[PDB]
Design an enzyme around this catalytic site. Sequence first.
Site, mmCIF file in Angstrom:
data_model
loop_
_atom_site.group_PDB
_atom_site.id
_atom_site.type_symbol
_atom_site.label_atom_id
_atom_site.label_comp_id
_atom_site.label_asym_id
_atom_site.label_seq_id
_atom_site.Cartn_x
_atom_site.Cartn_y
_atom_site.Cartn_z
ATOM 1 N N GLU A 128 -64.539 24.542 -3.424
ATOM 2 C CA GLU A 128 -65.518 24.156 -2.362
ATOM 3 C C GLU A 128 -64.811 23.331 -1.387
ATOM 4 O O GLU A 128 -65.228 23.366 -0.239
ATOM 5 C CB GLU A 128 -66.647 23.317 -3.024
ATOM 6 C CG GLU A 128 -68.228 23.777 -2.097
ATOM 7 C CD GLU A 128 -69.160 22.789 -2.598
ATOM 8 O OE1 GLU A 128 -69.641 22.526 -3.877
ATOM 9 O OE2 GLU A 128 -69.844 22.104 -1.525
ATOM 10 N N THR A 155 -38.962 2.369 2.896
ATOM 11 C CA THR A 155 -37.549 1.882 1.682
ATOM 12 C C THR A 155 -36.505 2.868 2.157
ATOM 13 O O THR A 155 -35.212 2.439 1.614
ATOM 14 C CB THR A 155 -38.306 1.627 0.355
ATOM 15 O OG1 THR A 155 -39.170 2.638 0.087
ATOM 16 C CG2 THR A 155 -38.601 0.295 0.234
HETATM 17 N N1 LIG Z 1 -49.457 3.527 -0.207
HETATM 18 C C1 LIG Z 1 -48.179 3.344 -0.823
HETATM 19 N N2 LIG Z 1 -47.192 3.887 -0.653
HETATM 20 C C2 LIG Z 1 -46.234 3.403 -1.348
HETATM 21 C C3 LIG Z 1 -46.300 2.925 -2.563
HETATM 22 N N3 LIG Z 1 -44.732 2.794 -3.235
HETATM 23 C C4 LIG Z 1 -43.978 3.511 -2.327
HETATM 24 N N4 LIG Z 1 -44.686 4.046 -1.168
HETATM 25 C C5 LIG Z 1 -44.026 4.661 0.026
HETATM 26 O O1 LIG Z 1 -43.439 5.759 -0.596
HETATM 27 C C6 LIG Z 1 -42.077 5.933 0.044
HETATM 28 C C7 LIG Z 1 -41.241 5.489 -0.922
HETATM 29 O O2 LIG Z 1 -41.132 6.330 -2.015
HETATM 30 P P1 LIG Z 1 -40.983 5.891 -3.311
HETATM 31 O O3 LIG Z 1 -42.581 6.452 -4.107
HETATM 32 O O4 LIG Z 1 -41.292 4.503 -3.704
HETATM 33 O O5 LIG Z 1 -40.187 6.613 -4.346
HETATM 34 P P2 LIG Z 1 -40.138 7.493 -5.794
HETATM 35 O O6 LIG Z 1 -40.869 8.518 -5.587
HETATM 36 O O7 LIG Z 1 -40.246 6.806 -6.877
HETATM 37 O O8 LIG Z 1 -38.618 8.377 -5.608
HETATM 38 P P3 LIG Z 1 -37.356 7.657 -5.973
HETATM 39 O O9 LIG Z 1 -37.269 6.028 -6.352
HETATM 40 O O10 LIG Z 1 -36.273 7.836 -5.139
HETATM 41 O O11 LIG Z 1 -36.841 8.543 -7.424
HETATM 42 C C8 LIG Z 1 -42.183 4.814 1.280
HETATM 43 O O12 LIG Z 1 -42.990 5.681 2.433
HETATM 44 C C9 LIG Z 1 -43.087 3.981 0.717
HETATM 45 O O13 LIG Z 1 -43.638 2.971 1.879
HETATM 46 C C10 LIG Z 1 -47.415 2.274 -3.063
HETATM 47 O O14 LIG Z 1 -47.860 1.746 -4.039
HETATM 48 N N5 LIG Z 1 -48.434 2.746 -2.008
#
Ligand SMILES: Nc1nc2c(ncn2[C@@H]2O[C@H](COP(=O)(O)OP(=O)(O)OP(=O)(O)O)[C@@H](O)[C@H]2O)c(=O)[nH]1
Lengths: 42, 432, 431
Positions: free
Chosen positions: C247, C172
């Site tokens: 562990e 994203t």
């Molecule tokens: N596996 C997985 N990856 C996710 C998911 N949501 C976001 N990501 C991944 O995490 C990254 C984006 O970060 P986010 O977790 O969405 O953002 P955030 O931690 O909420 O941070 P901000 O929105 O910037 O405040 C990208 O690599 C996405 O592909 C999810 O539900 N599952």
Amino acid sequence: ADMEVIELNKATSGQSWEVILKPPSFDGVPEFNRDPSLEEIQ
Amino acid sequence: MREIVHIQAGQCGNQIGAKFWEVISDEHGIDPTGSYHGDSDLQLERINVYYNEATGNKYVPRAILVDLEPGTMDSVRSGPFGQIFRPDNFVFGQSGAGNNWAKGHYTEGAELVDSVLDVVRKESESCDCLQGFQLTHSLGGGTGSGMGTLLISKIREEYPDRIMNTFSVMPSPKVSDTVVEPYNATLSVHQLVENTDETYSIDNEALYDICFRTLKLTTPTYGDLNHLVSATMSGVTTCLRFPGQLNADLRKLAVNMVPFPRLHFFMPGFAPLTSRGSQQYRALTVPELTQQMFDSKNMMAACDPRHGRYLTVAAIFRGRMSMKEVDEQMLNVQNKNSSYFVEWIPNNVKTAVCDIPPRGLKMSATFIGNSTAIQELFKRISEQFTAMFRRKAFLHWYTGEGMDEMEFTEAESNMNDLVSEYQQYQDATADE
Amino acid sequence: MRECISIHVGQAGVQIGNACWELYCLEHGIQPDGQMPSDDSFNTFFSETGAGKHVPRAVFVDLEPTVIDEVRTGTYRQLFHPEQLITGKEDAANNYARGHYTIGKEIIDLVLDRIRKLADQCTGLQGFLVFHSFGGGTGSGFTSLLMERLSVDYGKKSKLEFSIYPAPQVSTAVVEPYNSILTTHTTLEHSDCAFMVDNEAIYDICRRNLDIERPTYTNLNRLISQIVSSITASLRFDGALNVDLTEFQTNLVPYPRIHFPLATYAPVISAEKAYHEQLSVAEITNACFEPANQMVKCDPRHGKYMACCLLYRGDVVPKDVNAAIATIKTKRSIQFVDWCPTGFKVGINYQPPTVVPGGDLAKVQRAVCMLSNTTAIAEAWARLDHKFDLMYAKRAFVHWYVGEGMEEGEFSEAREDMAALEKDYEEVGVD
Ligand SMILES: Nc1nc2c(ncn2[C@@H]2O[C@H](COP(=O)(O)OP(=O)(O)OP(=O)(O)O)[C@@H](O)[C@H]2O)c(=O)[nH]1
Ligand SMILES: Nc1nc2c(ncn2[C@@H]2O[C@H](COP(=O)(O)OP(=O)(O)O)[C@@H](O)[C@H]2O)c(=O)[nH]1
Ligand SMILES: [Mg+2]
């Protein structure tokens, strides 16, 4: 064809053990490879 | 990050702004009374980004309408969606700017600015979490251009941490209402380089060329040009007003699109190109939509993207289509056209798909590019400026307002530095 | 009693948390309202109220409310108490500096106060399980801030991570390599053991094994949750291996910095498929040494093992396992470092894998999760470091971080620490 196994435990849902196929080649513990506080963070 | 405060300044600003509000109201299923009559929960999910919810079922645009001239305001109120706007949000002067940037920025504009800030403060203090501001204006006029940039600077002073976004319409000799447009544009570009976080460079040269050459409209009107503007504005704001993962707010868009502070001028693109009357049309598949990204014919800024390199690209696909097909087609374009993307910004093309297509189309594509080719638009303005400035032609209109020659020299130099900066990154290599 | 507190940070962390807690409830027979009409080990993860309701020992944190708002409106809204679902107003906008400094500094004290209230309900707190993305501003920035504060407040208390390594298919932000390196540098000295999950590896498993054309986060998370459940099953049930958090560290971590095990799971079978033969212990064990079943994309054949844990679940007999390990050794090199024995620590947890009803995964009689500490994982760091270098050489996007109060020197420091980490994996594999 030969191998060693070392039994650890058994429980309600478990049973674990070690397995050795080629023992340590050098002998002995690993030989290769701060703080903070609240003040330090702020 | 939630609310966006919208500002409309000058004739062009109000004309384009009014069209934006009728287009997005239709997409969100809002009628001219403010009542939601749609039949999809997606229409209301992020309604709060552009609309305040008033007592009951009614939605009111968080829009401030500004002009130094009263006539345009009357035309907006008389319009189709004219009744949707907050009455207290119309801020107009009586003494126009007379297509003079100096009158808009220093004289008449300065006199009205406080009345506008009072209305923007009212809207801003009502916000749970203000993202920032969105200004629609022309750069060739006096109010939109001069007062618009004065407002940007005054707002930046009070809200220095909010995102400042603009939809700035570039003047062209092809559809010109004044001989001094190169002066007004250069003086405004100087202000935007310093004061905005993101600017959508909407070029009347490109809009005229699309209408005349592509749409085969022998004599294009502002109505014809504005139909392309409103289609673009709807496309570039899709991510902000509907639920999505990519560029969901003004700051995330800026963080993904702006690698260097001054290089925040976007080249918008749109496919398919349609005329107001053209409600035909039977066409446009995913490979067809994707191919128009490099198509200079589909650019809203009169620049050839193949004359530069893309620093960053945001592509928005609208309608019912395969996400798999979009991903394949988008990867193909980057691999085939490797040479038009900078190698030192990995995975610099981000794609989003929205199920809701714009009105009249079943399938559409919007492109937002941060391309080094935008220097062609700035060069054009600088050369038009210099042709006049060399002879100090019409300078009395500006010096007569209290302006000094140095401001002209400074604005021009800053714009040429911007061109030089784009050229620098165009020539940069991942020799790293 | 040995309680474990789970912390879910940012969208990725919260969404994976939703998948994990849904699965734990299915495994322990807990309904979405916290009720269960009932071994006793589940108490390490769920506390109990006066009304006989079972509440997850967890905190969900996000700087934006959207994601958590879904948890508090969703099916499991009664499972969690409102105070354990924490949200801010303004997100970190994919900026580590915003998450760590600007925005994070406002909510940090509130988050730690909630964690403290959960810790007060524990008689033998083992430590923390931290779920977050590397890529997002909250996932990166807030997590490192929280990890630092947790080391201060919870002196020598175990902290394990489930980190979402970024993938372009689902990325994203263009700035994800920056956020990833900044969070890894800052968290390195505060984490005891970290399990990376490469979104591309998961995306490819969903496409290949589950026949999902365009995998969604829902598809990815269900698969992730299965691996998390495999790792945590011996804490939540009366297990024999990885019985406590200490562990994990003892079994898999030979040096403090080399704390990144590679997870490999098998079998991953489509539910919408014709009835097939159940996989034997030999078949699932063979699948652990196939790079296609890995949670991180890398080549173990080009690296060296320093520790291998095999966690079996369901209808599994020790005789079957030993026979499978013996055949593997005859065909494969399975190269270990000079200072380590060539071996496996094996654990069998009697409960068969549970799957979400109407999910993409088929129900199997037996499954296995291999946790191996291999030098091949350094390949994942190299890919990330190279993307960082490409942008950093031009200082592209750096102004966004500097503007938030970060110094350019922090970027150099973070990258030098990553260079030292890559060098450590190289030095460890030498002889
Ligand atoms: N596996 C997985 N990856 C996710 C998911 N949501 C976001 N990501 C991944 O995490 C990254 C984006 O970060 P986010 O977790 O969405 O953002 P955030 O931690 O909420 O941070 P901000 O929105 O910037 O405040 C990208 O690599 C996405 O592909 C999810 O539900 N599952
Ligand atoms: N696209 C478009 N351009 C317009 C419109 N009205 C005026 N312009 C352009 O805007 C510039 C003139 O500025 P204008 O907005 O009329 O003056 P102001 O009222 O003082 O801001 C020229 O470049 C015109 O071609 C309109 O409705 N649409
Ligand atoms: Mg987020």
